[PDB]
Amino acid sequence: KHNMKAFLDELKAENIKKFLYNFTQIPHLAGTEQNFQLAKQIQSQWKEFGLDSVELAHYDVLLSYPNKTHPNYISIINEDGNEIFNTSLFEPPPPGYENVSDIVPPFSAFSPQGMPEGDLVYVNYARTEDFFKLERDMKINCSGKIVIARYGKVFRGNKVKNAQLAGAKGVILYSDPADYFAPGVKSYPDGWNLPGGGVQRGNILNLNGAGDPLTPGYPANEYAYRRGIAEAVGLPSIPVHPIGYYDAQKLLEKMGGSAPPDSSWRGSLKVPYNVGPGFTGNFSTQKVKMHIHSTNEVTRIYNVIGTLRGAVEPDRYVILGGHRDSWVFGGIDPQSGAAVVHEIVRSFGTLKKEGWRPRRTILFASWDAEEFGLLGSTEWAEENSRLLQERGVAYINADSSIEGNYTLRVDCTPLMYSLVHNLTKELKSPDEGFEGKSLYESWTKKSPSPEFSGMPRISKLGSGNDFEVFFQRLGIASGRARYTKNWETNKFSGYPLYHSVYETYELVEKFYDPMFKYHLTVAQVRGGMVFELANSIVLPFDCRDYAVVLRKYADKIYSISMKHPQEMKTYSVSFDSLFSAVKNFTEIASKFSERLQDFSNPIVLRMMNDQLMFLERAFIDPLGLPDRPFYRHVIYAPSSHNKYAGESFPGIYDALFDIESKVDPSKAWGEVKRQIYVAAFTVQAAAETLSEVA
Amino acid sequence: KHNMKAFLDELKAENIKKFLYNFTQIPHLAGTEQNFQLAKQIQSQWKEFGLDSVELAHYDVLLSYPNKTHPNYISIINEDGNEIFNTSLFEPPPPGYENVSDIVPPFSAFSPQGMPEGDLVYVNYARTEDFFKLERDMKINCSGKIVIARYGKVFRGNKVKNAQLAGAKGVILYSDPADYFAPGVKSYPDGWNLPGGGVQRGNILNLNGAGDPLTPGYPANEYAYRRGIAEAVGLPSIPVHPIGYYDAQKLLEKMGGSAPPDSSWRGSLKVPYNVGPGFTGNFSTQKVKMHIHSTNEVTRIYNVIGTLRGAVEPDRYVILGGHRDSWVFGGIDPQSGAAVVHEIVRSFGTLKKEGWRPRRTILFASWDAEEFGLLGSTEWAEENSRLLQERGVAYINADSSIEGNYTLRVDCTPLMYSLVHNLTKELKSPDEGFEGKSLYESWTKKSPSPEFSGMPRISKLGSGNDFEVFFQRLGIASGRARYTKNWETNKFSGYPLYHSVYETYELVEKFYDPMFKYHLTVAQVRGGMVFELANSIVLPFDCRDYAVVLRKYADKIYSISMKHPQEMKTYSVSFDSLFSAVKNFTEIASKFSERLQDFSNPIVLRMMNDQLMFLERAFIDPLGLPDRPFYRHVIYAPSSHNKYAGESFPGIYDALFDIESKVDPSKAWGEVKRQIYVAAFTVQAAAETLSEVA
Ligand SMILES: *[C@@H]1O[C@H](CO)[C@@H](O[C@@H]2O[C@H](CO)[C@@H](O[C@@H]3O[C@H](CO)[C@@H](O)[C@H](O[C@H]4O[C@H](CO)[C@@H](O)[C@H](O)[C@@H]4O)[C@@H]3O)[C@H](O)[C@H]2NC(C)=O)[C@H](O)[C@H]1NC(C)=O
Ligand SMILES: *[C@@H]1O[C@H](CO)[C@@H](O[C@@H]2O[C@H](CO)[C@@H](O[C@@H]3O[C@H](CO)[C@@H](O)[C@H](O[C@H]4O[C@H](CO)[C@@H](O)[C@H](O)[C@@H]4O)[C@@H]3O)[C@H](O)[C@H]2NC(C)=O)[C@H](O)[C@H]1NC(C)=O
Ligand SMILES: *[C@@H]1O[C@H](CO)[C@@H](O[C@@H]2O[C@H](CO)[C@@H](O[C@@H]3O[C@H](CO)[C@@H](O)[C@H](O)[C@@H]3O)[C@H](O)[C@H]2NC(C)=O)[C@H](O)[C@H]1NC(C)=O
Ligand SMILES: *[C@@H]1O[C@H](CO)[C@@H](O[C@@H]2O[C@H](CO)[C@@H](O[C@@H]3O[C@H](CO)[C@@H](O)[C@H](O)[C@@H]3O)[C@H](O)[C@H]2NC(C)=O)[C@H](O)[C@H]1NC(C)=O
Ligand SMILES: *[C@@H]1O[C@H](CO[C@@H]2O[C@@H](C)[C@@H](O)[C@@H](O)[C@@H]2O)[C@@H](O[C@@H]2O[C@H](CO)[C@@H](O)[C@H](O)[C@H]2NC(C)=O)[C@H](O)[C@H]1NC(C)=O
Ligand SMILES: *[C@@H]1O[C@H](CO[C@@H]2O[C@@H](C)[C@@H](O)[C@@H](O)[C@@H]2O)[C@@H](O[C@@H]2O[C@H](CO)[C@@H](O)[C@H](O)[C@H]2NC(C)=O)[C@H](O)[C@H]1NC(C)=O
Ligand SMILES: *[C@@H]1O[C@H](CO[C@@H]2O[C@@H](C)[C@@H](O)[C@@H](O)[C@@H]2O)[C@@H](O[C@@H]2O[C@H](CO)[C@@H](O)[C@H](O)[C@H]2NC(C)=O)[C@H](O)[C@H]1NC(C)=O
Ligand SMILES: *[C@@H]1O[C@H](CO[C@@H]2O[C@@H](C)[C@@H](O)[C@@H](O)[C@@H]2O)[C@@H](O[C@@H]2O[C@H](CO)[C@@H](O)[C@H](O)[C@H]2NC(C)=O)[C@H](O)[C@H]1NC(C)=O
Ligand SMILES: *[C@@H]1O[C@H](CO)[C@@H](O[C@@H]2O[C@H](CO)[C@@H](O)[C@H](O)[C@H]2NC(C)=O)[C@H](O)[C@H]1NC(C)=O
Ligand SMILES: *[C@@H]1O[C@H](CO)[C@@H](O[C@@H]2O[C@H](CO)[C@@H](O)[C@H](O)[C@H]2NC(C)=O)[C@H](O)[C@H]1NC(C)=O
Ligand SMILES: O=C(O)CC[C@H](NP(=O)(O)OCCCCc1ccccc1)C(=O)O
Ligand SMILES: O=C(O)CC[C@H](NP(=O)(O)OCCCCc1ccccc1)C(=O)O
Ligand SMILES: *[C@@H]1O[C@H](CO)[C@@H](O)[C@H](O)[C@H]1NC(C)=O
Ligand SMILES: *[C@@H]1O[C@H](CO)[C@@H](O)[C@H](O)[C@H]1NC(C)=O
Ligand SMILES: *[C@@H]1O[C@H](CO)[C@@H](O)[C@H](O)[C@H]1NC(C)=O
Ligand SMILES: *[C@@H]1O[C@H](CO)[C@@H](O)[C@H](O)[C@H]1NC(C)=O
Ligand SMILES: [Ca+2]
Ligand SMILES: [Ca+2]
Ligand SMILES: [Cl-]
Ligand SMILES: [Cl-]
Ligand SMILES: [Zn+2]
Ligand SMILES: [Zn+2]
Ligand SMILES: [Zn+2]
Ligand SMILES: [Zn+2]
């Protein structure tokens, strides 16, 4: 028989291993010839595997690269202007790769050019609350200083945004061993820790879902009108560069000025972690000088788009997508995900060759330029937004399959919760000590839900990956699953070798997943979700799970507001409408579920499947969130302080944030009330899509 | 049998007459108790007639009324400050109505309060080109002057916008006999001409599709957050008041300064039509003084919404809507339309009582507060936008059924052209001399198409009526039909008694349509369209007709640009992408039509009906047009110079308009190129919705 079990049994750990090896022998940086050749290879193989059509969709987007003949570096200079210490021009390459060409040296993509010289201020993780502490509590002024911040906790683009608004004239990012060196493990190549010469690459844009900086709203096709660089979306205005902890120690060791305010500001290096500004007495005349010469350049990128046409509902799309471009070899990010996608396509294709087709159409995507700001997935979604609006059932992302080997990590819309629970109860756990137990059992034991006994944790989607346009802009139900580490406080920081030259096939094969069993488990979860979404007669979404979470989020936002009782009295700030809407949604969702269980009539079925499909779509506000027009979902948005984290009722959350500091409280509380109205209205409107249609 | 002929035969002229009488005995001004009672009556009767559900949907919106104890008027004052002439405080009521209460005196709704005193400038119709002529050619400065303009040619809100941007401190609108007194016909009550004491009421907002000025984007429900008045959408900043031609003559007769520039500036009164500023020598010290004391007030309004549930596709809506509120008795506008809607509901209900139901759901709407800016239809569409987005098949408007008795006038999306041609070939002409001929035959003879022999004229939709939110904001295929006059140059001016106390039942019954045969013909056209849209198996839309018009509009916009060949060379302005997209749309539409004719499979049918339904939707750009976020359709928008007229490729049209006067041509031509890109992209994206789905 051709059922989910046939599909799942065809998936093989050894094939995933072979594909991962094949994808990680050379760098595949977006916009380079090597990544175009890999795109052509995947296109060819997906056709071989049995897909109906496989095409490349290309766009010309703004990318950023170092200048090969004028390298980026940071110096300490003396009063004479002699450079007495220079940071590294490249990471020492790993064993056997010391002769690989085209390894991009560490840089921060989209940094402007400059050579700013100044006194250092150390800003911890450069979070909003770190800048509050510096400026409000310690009275340290970052204006015209070079800020040095440790990576970790929040997206690096937010750090740069925060440093820019503090008045900094440059930003140095570094990896502290406190965040990137696990105690008791060896550094690469002898273990999975970051060596002192390792450096995390990555873009520092603040695009807020815009996609290519030059073409917000529209695909960057052959006739596109491009903004001039001065009007581009999201580019930083100050130079930025990343370094490793051997170089960081040389910059930090001389720091003077104020002591760190507390131990949460101190990393693991043998330095005081003084905040500055500037160096201690003996070195007070030395300065730090950045030399950044990278260039932004419009460059062609290529997505591979494979189609497996549905037998019954070919105009309903279930999309499995993940990126193909990497900073260097991409051993974990993204090729551990891409190898899983490749084996899923192979498996679906095996069933297709035997005469099977899914009920709905499945689209498979290998996205380009994810690492430069989700560019490939966003431009393609801008080009196809009308088809996706009206036909998109769900998007399952497929970036890195492992970032650890401890347990599963799932983030998704509440509409998918029941599907994920049910599927993981049918899959085998790969974990030691759980042989013969379900994946649901191991996952629930290792990652218990904070509010429900005997359930696992499932998080909110934010951004920082290719689902963002489908979920936050277009309102298509989205989900993701991967294996992760125990390390909770590092949940946004990345594994130690993240975006470094050391993230190789050998890293994965020796230290993460030698048997490829975690990869296989992730392939089963992602593939199984796609299979059920594409083949179930009734779409496998449960609206009642949205009702439960909406109440939780309403309680949460009300609790934030209730820290200001006097202002709520003064300005008559009521959450009554929002709770009313949530109560209505709960009542209507319950009734719809009864009809769904209780309804041979394919028009009623498809009418009901359309109500299911358009329910996520109903949370979209076509006017977007304040000053973020491409984040349109009213229940979830990426946090304005950390793109990686999701925020619920983001319009109200941002209106309340730091409200006690606003200099016109009447205006600020008016905006809280406006956002409560928008949220209550959108919840009620979404509820009404589940009422009887006439 | 229950087919269209059964439906059409049930419609009766005598019932329409009875309903019109019943709806026009007292005023039904929006927000008044009389109009709430009429709403309750219609709700009751629609239930009686057989609808499944009939509800009132209420909103609290900003309305405007004169102050009953402090009347509006205009004076000529002398140097001493004595008021030597005053305009009328009310229109002399018509015979038998001299004791009717609650006739609102003439005023311009939403005028601010003020008592500005100054010199008059006469600005013709106050059109964009009239202000260009004054300011660029005649060198007359309107700053700080009171402008007097004749009604006609363009929406009165555009005149006020134009006067405001010219620096005027007040606007006086009047009805010139050249535009409102047809030669050889008697004035009311002895004929259908405007008497010298008659005055046209009407709002002067510039909402650009926003709906209630205080709640743009969201319905004005019980918990809505309202903008403060200073941030409201669309309100004029200078006082405005309308007067009749007896009063106008007293203001114009003393005008001095410059002669009118040519005969197109001279109306039919016995005055010089001097432009001013100010009065001739003897009266040079007299001034004009306005006294406006109207107030804006948030007031409850009520729409009646009736549902006839579809038998097969109840989640697909065909909507027949028209307004119920009138300025005074509403004998033509809107009750000649509302009486037709009432007879259509009665007829559908007769079939329902015999066991019939339409294939799709039909919604019937009696909208409130149309006269104050499309408020009722827009607030309801804001409340229900998600349901309408995903389920709305078509909207047929039903305002005034006659504005004359010469021939049919149809404005609609190209998707409806074939439906209108086919239906009018099956209906009988009511016209004298065409007995036994089709309505298509009489219409085609009296109103020939400018580009096609043997076809009738069908115009573009603009705005100024309740279809605006459904078509221009939400992208739902829309159409309208009514009987009209021969008078081409008055096509936007209104019939003579438009918005006057004289527009009564007797006007209609004596001078427009004594037998009610034109009303019956309009009921057949509107009802027949609704019947076919709601009952045809395949939706009756022809995408190939959009391809034909898109080529016409592309040729038209290219021709405007080609008046500037040097700039097109300098800035490399190419329309090649737009013509390419139009060519692709033509090719794909042809192929889709073949499949549609060539395809027992209800999934393929509904898949194809969805492609038909979502085709109008594909022309919506979610970012809206420049500075007009609620006009989102890329092919059509209301003209920025005249809300009543439609403009094609409005983004490019507005970018090119008066471009030779812009002081940064590089920037202005860059914006032309940006709009060509948006238009070519949207045409191609819409084309792609008609491709095979997978
Ligand atoms: C959740 O769903 C419920 C339906 O179960 C829905 O209830 C609706 O609530 C509104 C607001 O409370 C009701 O609106 C009232 O409607 C009546 C006429 O039906 C009006 O007369 C009322 O206005 C008077 O009273 C107001 C309040 O004191 C005054 O401000 C006003 O000036 C008037 O004097 C009022 O508009 C509505 O009838 C119910 N509908 C029902 C029960 O069917 C509720 O709104 C939903 N929640 C959300 C957030 O949408
Ligand atoms: C109407 O539909 C047609 C399809 O019938 C569609 O044609 C497409 O047009 C684009 C642009 O002309 C083609 O894009 C080319 O794609 C190839 C690879 O397939 C590229 O190599 C080309 O780029 C090179 O040449 C450019 C132009 O000189 C250079 O600027 C560039 O730097 C490269 O050297 C180019 O991108 C596309 O292949 C066809 N697709 C087909 C034929 O299937 C047309 O775009 C549609 N019209 C609109 C308005 O969408
Ligand atoms: C995840 O798995 C659960 C457990 O199987 C699914 O819930 C079950 O769904 C079925 C089918 O809808 C329900 O069966 C129904 O029983 C009622 C009796 O009340 C009957 O009227 C229907 O004809 C039908 O037989 C069953 O009650 C329900 N079990 C529960 C909620 O415990 C769930 O749907 C799955 N989630 C998915 C597919 O997203
Ligand atoms: C308006 O009326 C015209 C004239 O009847 C309609 O066009 C006609 O539509 C029918 C049905 O689609 C076409 O018949 C078809 O003939 C082909 C042979 O090519 C065959 O393959 C199909 O099975 C079917 O019998 C007919 O050709 C066509 N006539 C034309 C274009 O002159 C038109 O559809 C009506 N418009 C509406 C309903 O919006
Ligand atoms: C990338 O950098 C090259 C090389 O920069 C030169 O060598 C560096 C080590 C340093 O000394 C720089 O200041 C040098 O200019 C740039 O190529 C130079 O460009 C200039 C003017 O544009 C030209 O006159 C020089 O001859 C070039 N020098 C060499 C050695 O080729 C090039 O501009 C940069 N590429 C970019 C910005 O895309
Ligand atoms: C730190 O580096 C500077 C600059 O070195 C140049 O650029 C580097 C990226 C690398 O490619 C070097 O080989 C280049 O020479 C050194 O300062 C330079 O020293 C040279 C030779 O003594 C001198 O002629 C240049 O004028 C100097 N340039 C500048 C900008 O000062 C410096 O010595 C290095 N410091 C240490 C401690 O190694
Ligand atoms: C509507 O107008 C009334 C009446 O206006 C008064 O009578 C006019 C003919 C003229 O002489 C005005 O200047 C008068 O004020 C307003 O009622 C008055 O309001 C004021 C102060 O608000 C009060 O002291 C007076 O007693 C009132 N006069 C009378 C005769 O009732 C009323 O404000 C207006 N309604 C509005 C603005 O909604
Ligand atoms: C034109 O009208 C003004 C004002 O008249 C008042 O307001 C009108 C709306 C109407 O309701 C009148 O009955 C009101 O008296 C006249 O000027 C007023 O005249 C009266 C009586 O002589 C005097 O006491 C007031 O002060 C005047 N008010 C003002 C504002 O000047 C004027 O006489 C009328 N002109 C003509 C030619 O009839
Ligand atoms: C990755 O695997 C692919 C597919 O097997 C390899 O590409 C093939 O290479 C052979 C031998 O050079 C050719 O004959 C085929 O035409 C290629 N097939 C394609 C591109 O579809 C590729 O060599 C492998 N890459 C690495 C680094 O091992
Ligand atoms: C318009 O017609 C309606 C409906 O026939 C009339 O309202 C009815 O009036 C009778 C007699 O007063 C009542 O018994 C009914 O209850 C009313 N029915 C309703 C409101 O549904 C109304 O009188 C007519 N109006 C005019 C001005 O002729
Ligand atoms: O520009 C964007 O929005 C994101 C681009 C890019 N996304 P990507 O590296 O593929 O994935 C984000 C991973 C977040 C850090 C992390 C956290 C836990 C485990 C592994 C990695 C980035 O974060 O740099
Ligand atoms: O605010 C709006 O957009 C329009 C409100 C309102 N619409 P409405 O009077 O119902 O219909 C517009 C009629 C336009 C003038 C006209 C033109 C020809 C025949 C009759 C009437 C108005 O134009 O004042
Ligand atoms: C920080 O420094 C600059 C002076 O160099 C000044 O303009 C700015 O206002 C300062 N801010 C504070 C908060 O002291
Ligand atoms: C993978 O699991 C192994 C053995 O179960 C553990 O020793 C190792 O540290 C884990 N690898 C990572 C990268 O966490
Ligand atoms: C019109 O009049 C005012 C002076 O009262 C002046 O400010 C304005 O610039 C004038 N405009 C022109 C074009 O003369
Ligand atoms: C209606 O038609 C009649 C007779 O056919 C004509 O005399 C009359 O003027 C028309 N009425 C209007 C308002 O045009
Ligand atoms: Ca773009
Ligand atoms: Ca509103
Ligand atoms: Cl993922
Ligand atoms: Cl109409
Ligand atoms: Zn990634
Ligand atoms: Zn990455
Ligand atoms: Zn009207
Ligand atoms: Zn009107």
Count CB pairs under 8 A between chains A and B.
122
Could B602 and A607 be called an inter-chain contact, meaning their C-beta atoms sit closer than 8 Å?
A: no
Cα separation of A74 and A96, whole Å?
Answer: 29
The count of structural domains within chain B is 3
Helix axes B335-353 and B517-535, enclosed angle (nearest 10):
50
DSSP state at residue B39? H
Name the 3-class secondary structure at A380.
Answer: helix
Q: Are B278 and B48 in contact (CB under 8 A)?
A: no
Among the atoms of ligand 10, which is closest to the Cα of residue B37?
A: 20
- Rounded to 5°, the CA angle A275-A278-A279 comes to 95
Q: Is the CB of A143 under 6 A from ligand 13?
A: yes
Q: Are residues A93 and A219 in the same domain?
A: yes
Task: Measure Cα distances from A62 to A230, A232, A303, A414 in Å.
Answer: 13, 10, 16, 35
CA B139 to chain centre: 34
Residue-wise burial string across A303-312, b where 16 or more C-beta atoms lie within 10 A, e elsewhere: bbbbbbbbee
Give alpha helix (H) positions in A166-218: 177-180
Question: After which residues, if any, is chain B broken (C to N > 2.5 Å)?
Answer: 599
Residue A269: partners with Cβ closer than 8 Å, 6 or more residues away: A176, A177, A245, A248, A249, A252
Sign of the CA dihedral running A669, A670, A672, A673: positive
Residue-wise burial string across B656-687, b where 16 or more C-beta atoms lie within 10 A, e elsewhere: beebeeeeeeeebbbbbbbbbbbbbbbbbbbb
Q: Are B199 and B106 in contact (CB under 8 A)?
A: yes
Out of A309, A622, A673, closest to residue B622 by CB: A622
Out of B313, B390, B618, closest to residue A614 by CB: B390
Cα separation of B417 and B451, whole Å?
Answer: 14
Give alpha helix (H) positions in B433-575: 439-446, 468, 505-507, 517-535, 543-561, 565-570
Name the 3-class secondary structure at B70.
Answer: coil
Q: Are residues A35 and A93 in the same domain?
A: no
Question: After which residues, if any, is chain A broken (C to N > 2.5 Å)?
Answer: 599
Last residue in a domain, options B505, B540, B575:
B540
Q: Are residues A386 and A507 in the same domain?
A: yes
Q: Give DSSP secondary structure letters for A9-76.
A: HH--HHHHHHHHHHHSSS---TTSHHHHHHHHHHHHHHHHHT-SEEEEEEEEEEEEE--TTS--EEEE
Beta strand B120-122 pairing with B146-150: parallel
Sign of the CA dihedral running B434, B437, B443, B444: negative
Q: Are B244 and B73 in contact (CB under 8 A)?
A: no
CA B663 to chain centre: 34
Return the amino acid letter for B305: I
Q: Are A571 and A670 in contact (CB under 8 A)?
A: yes
Query: Token pair for residue B315?
Result: 């989640």
Name the 3-class secondary structure at A615.
Answer: helix
Return the amino acid letter for B124: N
Peptide bond into A93 cis (omega under 30): no
Give alpha helix (H) positions in A228-322: 245-252
Cα separation of A63 and A372, whole Å?
Answer: 7
The total number of residues shown for chain B amounts to 694
Give the position of tokens 């911040």.
A149
Q: Give DSSP secondary structure letters for B515-526.
A: T-HHHHHHHHHH
Closest Cα partner for B636 from B623, B649, B626, B621? B649
Could B603 and A606 be called an inter-chain contact, meaning their C-beta atoms sit closer than 8 Å?
A: yes
Sign of the CA dihedral running A505, A401, A316, A301: negative
Q: Are residues B381 and B494 in the same domain?
A: yes
Closest Cα partner for B516 from B21, B2, B4, B5? B21
φ, ψ of residue B174 to 5 degrees: the values are -140, 160
CATH of the domain at B680: 1.20.930.40
Query: Token pair for residue A120?
Result: 């250092």
Q: Are residues B223 and B95 in the same domain?
A: yes
Q: Are A118 and A209 in contact (CB under 8 A)?
A: no
Q: Are B308 and B348 in contact (CB under 8 A)?
A: yes
DSSP state at residue A260? P
- Rounded to 5°, the CA angle B248-B254-B255 comes to 90
Residue-wise burial string across A278-297, b where 16 or more C-beta atoms lie within 10 A, e elsewhere: bbeeebeebbbbbbbbbebe
Last residue in a domain, options B259, B292, B325:
B292
Peptide bond into A334 cis (omega under 30): yes
Question: Is B499 annotated among the ligand-binding residues?
Answer: yes
Last residue in a domain, options A521, A540, A559:
A540
Closest Cα partner for B375 from B228, B232, B162? B232
3-state secondary structure A130-169: HHHHHHHHCCCCCCCCEEEEECECECHHHHHHHHHHCCCC
Query: Token pair for residue B97?
Result: 């109505």
Task: Measure Cα distances from B584 to A29, B685, B689, B691 in Å.
Answer: 35, 10, 12, 11
Element (H, E) at A170: strand A170-174
Q: Are residues A206 and A98 in the same domain?
A: yes
A56 DSSP β-pair partners:
A304
The strands making up A295-308's β-sheet, listed across from edge to edge, are: A53-65, A295-308, A360-367, A313-323, A392-397, A477-484, A407-412
Give alpha helix (H) positions in B145-264: 156-165, 177-180, 245-252
Return the amino acid letter for B206: N
Q: What residues does ligand 9 touch, defined as CB less than 6 Å away?
A: A 22, 25, 41, 44-45
Question: Is B390 annotated among the ligand-binding residues?
Answer: no
Measured between beta carbons, the chain A residues lying within 8 angstroms of B223 are 576-577, 677, 680
3-state secondary structure B426-458: CCECCCCCCCCCEHHHHHHHHCECCCCCCCECC
Closest Cα partner for B478 from B529, B423, B522, B426? B529
Q: Give DSSP secondary structure letters for A648-674.
A: ESHHHHHHHTTGGG-S-HHHHHHHHHH
Query: Token pair for residue B536?
Result: 């045809």
Farthest CA pair distance, chain A:
87
User: What is the number of other CB atoms lying within 10 angstroms of the CB of residue B126?
Assistant: 29
Q: Name which residue sits closest to atom 15 of ligand 1, judged by CA.
A: B222
- Containing structural domain, residue A593: 541-694
B288 DSSP β-pair partners:
B76, B118
CA B477 to chain centre: 16
Residue-wise burial string across A180-217, b where 16 or more C-beta atoms lie within 10 A, e elsewhere: bbbeeeebbbeebbbbbbbbbbbbbbbbbbbbbbbbbe
Cα separation of B658 and B652, whole Å?
Answer: 12
Name the 3-class secondary structure at A682.
Answer: helix
Sign of the CA dihedral running B568, B570, B573, B576: positive
Cα separation of B74 and A35, whole Å?
Answer: 76
Residue-wise burial string across B67-90, b where 16 or more C-beta atoms lie within 10 A, e elsewhere: eeeebbbbbbbeeeeeeeebbbee
Could B390 and A610 be called an inter-chain contact, meaning their C-beta atoms sit closer than 8 Å?
A: yes
Q: Are residues A482 and A365 in the same domain?
A: yes
Closest Cα partner for A397 from A318, A456, A455, A329? A318
Return the amino acid letter for B64: S
Query: Token pair for residue A685?
Result: 């409107």
Q: Are A11 and A344 in contact (CB under 8 A)?
A: yes
Q: Are residues A216 and A280 in the same domain?
A: yes
Question: Is A644 annotated among the ligand-binding residues?
Answer: yes
The strands making up B73-77's β-sheet, listed across from edge to edge, are: B83-86, B73-77, B287-291, B117-118
φ, ψ of residue A669 to 5 degrees: the values are -70, -30
Q: Are residues A629 and A521 in the same domain?
A: no
Element (H, E) at A553: helix A543-561
Q: Name which residue sits closest to atom 8 of ligand 5, judged by CA.
A: A70
| Distance from residue B676's CA to the centre of ligand 15 (Å) | 36
Q: Are B592 and B690 in contact (CB under 8 A)?
A: yes
Sign of the CA dihedral running B351, B352, B356, B361: positive
Give alpha helix (H) positions in B222-274: 245-252
- Rounded to 5°, the CA angle B435-B436-B440 comes to 95
Could B314 and A693 be called an inter-chain contact, meaning their C-beta atoms sit closer than 8 Å?
A: yes
Q: Are residues A490 and A597 in the same domain?
A: no
Q: How determined?
A: X-ray
Q: Are residues B350 and B310 in the same domain?
A: yes
Q: Are residues B155 and B262 in the same domain?
A: yes
Return the amino acid letter for B667: K
Question: Is A399 annotated among the ligand-binding residues?
Answer: yes
CATH of the domain at A24: 3.40.630.10
The total number of residues shown for chain A amounts to 694
Active site residues of B: 370, 574, 610, 633
Cα separation of A271 and A150, whole Å?
Answer: 14
CATH of the domain at A258: 3.50.30.30
- Rounded to 5°, the CA angle B164-B167-B169 comes to 75
Query: Token pair for residue A485?
Result: 């580490």
Cα separation of B630 and B652, whole Å?
Answer: 17
| Distance from residue A593's CA to the centre of ligand 3 (Å) | 10
Please name the residue of chain A whose CA is at the shortest distance from the CA of residue B386: A618
